[model samples]
Target: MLYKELGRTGEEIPALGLGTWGIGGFETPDYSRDEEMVELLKTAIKMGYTHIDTAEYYGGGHTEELIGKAIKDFRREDLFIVSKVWPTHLRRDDLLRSLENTLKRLDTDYVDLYLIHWPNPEIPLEETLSAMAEGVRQGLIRYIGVSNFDRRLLEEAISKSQEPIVCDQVKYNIEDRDPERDGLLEFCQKNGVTLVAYSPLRRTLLSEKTKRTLEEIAKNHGATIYQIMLAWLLAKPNVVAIPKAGRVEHLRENLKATEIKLSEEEMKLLDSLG
Candidate 1:
């Protein structure tokens, strides 16, 4: 297993984690597959996957419930669990309900990190952040996080909250390098906040030149393009990648990124592909 620090804090999470957005089946979601989910958790944990990121909006809290079932037998303290409050629920009352409901579904007293799912323009951002601060005060969440937030909105969150926001979870990949272009990456690095990369494997390679470049590099590593993609992101320490998987073998493939070491030349070529 590989690890990365949460910002500059002493806390560190597994570089690879199980993302449960669509895990345990989404359609007519049932508990019949729960044992399968449980084993997935057990195996990932047995293989050292300690961080599990899920959300309330994912199947209306069913994702967290499934994760709750999956991680039931595992050590209570060995895991780092994360969940979020929906933007629509950003009001103090609804936000508080979301937190309480999410925790109940997870069957855990607290999550290691709690996130605001998205920035809701209709609501007062201050109200949302205040609820987050209150959650931290009550020990329901250890850290604060936001997803899909641009830099300006992130600044608003930072200034309004009493607790420091630890991360801005966003879509980042080799081809979709919006974070780098938009200055969010720099802001996070400067502030000692970790940028959690969800959907790190964008798999949207279109340019023949870029494809050929990545293909040659993968051949050299005896790895897949996805592996190369994740390795490229993991090359930096302040970032963490969470590529979700239900199959143990696929999860193993995701774990391979932690072992890949890209040279400066190969990295330069990859960077040039953008």
Candidate 2:
């Protein structure tokens, strides 16, 4: 597996991190398959996936519990676990309390990285960020970040926080191009923040349709259409793709995309469709 620096945190994280939002949670369709999910997570770790992203809001904390149980035998230092606090818990005391509970659910003393799930318009930016800074000091969190934030809000958070924001997680993929057009990508690049692409494959849309263009591109690179899309995300200097695979075959197939490289001409051809 290929690894990249997670912003200024100085920790090298796998290019393809695992997102366990649906697989471990019980809410909104409950895709959890206990035995299969465990094997998938183990396969991911054995394949060199060190970063795992989850959130407290997912299944009212079942996601973190599943992750904690899955990695019980592995050394905690070898992995980079990232979790987020919900917007409702952005209050100073509530933020800290929420993190403590998250740690308990994850069966860990401290998380490698923690983030605010979303910016709460009702709460002052400083109020939320100050609590995050305190989290770092209290050893509850190591690196701080935000998810689903716009460029302006990101800049505001950075200005308020005592620590440098390490990453800005957002819904990014071939279809969701807001990161680039809205200046979020530029801001992250300029500020040395990593841009973690959540849905890098557009929820598997890139692989579902066997279009002439995708076939041609895949043939040229000796890759699958999914690999082509993943490689496209990797082609960017500041971007990383974290496409979730719920099965073993899908996990291995997704990991192969790290080896496929897209040339400038190929990028232009793909971009034209967008």
Candidate 3:
């Protein structure tokens, strides 16, 4: 798998990571359905996904618990586990409380990365980051990041933060190209922060040209259109794509995507699509 620097901190990250947004329902999880979710998490780790992104807001911490169990068998140092604090918990004390709760749920002493899940205007960025800095000092969180932040907010967070804000996780994909159209991607690229792209497949209804173009490229590479799109996204220098896939088939397909090389023309065609 291709890897990129996570931040100026000099850690390597996989071009494709696993996101846990779809694993469990919000506030309720059918315990019976957890069997497959368990295996899916295990499969993802066993298949060589180092970065596992989760949040306390996900299924009221059920997702983080499941991931904790899944990574228990593996060497803790082998994986880059990430979790987030909810917007409501942006206060200095609440942020630390949220991190502690997540650590307790995960059964891990420290997360590889911790983030503020959203930008809460009520709480100043410096206050939240001071708590994050405290986390780093206490050895509860190794790196600090943010999610669902806009360009201006991200810059402000970076400036206000005592430590380096390593990343800005945002919704980016072929259809949702706000990061590229907006200045977030360029800003992250320029400032040495990773722009993690979530919800890559949210816009599955591709245009006629998009499909035809992807199909044609997929035919040449003997890959699925999903793989083609992933390859296209991975071709970017500073963007990381975290596409959610639970089943074994889906995992295999996404892994295969890391190897497909899109042509310059093909990339241009895909980039031109909305």
Candidate 4:
């Protein structure tokens, strides 16, 4: 597994992680596949996917329950579990209460990192960050971050935070480069914040031309198109990726992406696809 720095703290985290958006369910809980989901998480963990990204809104918190059960067999210190609070819970008291509930669901005393699932423009970012700082001081969460935040909101978050903001999780992929186009990537790289790229593989099919380019690159590397996409994200200095996979084969494929080093030429080709 490859590791990268978290913010400028000099602390390192796995570059490849397991995203839990549809592990148990998406907007609602589904017990029909709970056992399978738990096994998948355990399998990924065994394969060195120590970083798991989750959110309160995922599966209505049933995803955290599954994760809690899966992590029981492993040493807590060996894993980096990340969870997020919903936008509606950004108020100080509500945020703290939400964190407590999240910890209970995860069955861990402290999450490795906690994040604001999405920015709530109605609430003051300063108030939200102050509450997060209190959580950090109380040792409820080790670090703080935000998801789906653009460059301007990220700038506000950094300045408002008393605790160092380590990550800016976003929906970044080969097909979607909003962060790159909007200067968020450069901002993160320059300021030492890890740009956590989620959904490296989008659900929709790629354009024919882009797909052909990815196919050619994959052929050269003897890898899959998915691997090429992940490798491209990993090549960036302040970037890491969490691509979800329920099947063991897919999990192994995602892990191997960390091993495929794209040459300058291949990187340029992939970059152009974005």
lDDT of 3 by residue, 99-154 (tens): 99999988999999998998889888899999899999999999999999989999
Per-residue lDDT for 1-274 in model 4, tens only?
Answer: 8999999988889999888888888899988898888888888899998999988888999999999999998999999999999999999999999999999999999999999999999999999999999999999999999999999999999988888999999989888999988999999999989999988887536888888999999999999989889899999899999888888999888788989989999888888887
Model 2 agreement with the true structure over 71-179: per-residue lDDT tens digits: 8868899998999999999999999999999999889999988999988899998988898898899888889999989898889888888988988899887667888
Candidate 4: clashing pairs of residues: none
Best by lDDT: 4
Question: Candidate 2: global Cα-lDDT?
Answer: 0.83
lDDT by residue (32-63, candidate 1, tens digit) is 67777777778887777889888888765677
Overall lDDT per candidate, in order of appearance: 0.84, 0.83, 0.86, 0.91
Q: In candidate 3, where is summed lDDT lowest over 10 consecutive residues? A: 24-33
Best by TM-score: 4
Sorted on TM-score, best first, the list reads 4, 3, 1, 2
- Candidate 3: list runs displaced more than 4 Å: 203-205
Question: TM-score for every candidate vs. truth?
Answer: 0.94, 0.93, 0.96, 0.98
Candidate 1: pairs in clash = none
Give candidate 4's whole-model lDDT. 0.91
Residue 144 accuracy (lDDT) in model 2: 91
Give the Cα error of residue 263 in candidate 1, in Å.
Answer: 0.5
Better of 2 and 3 by TM-score: 3
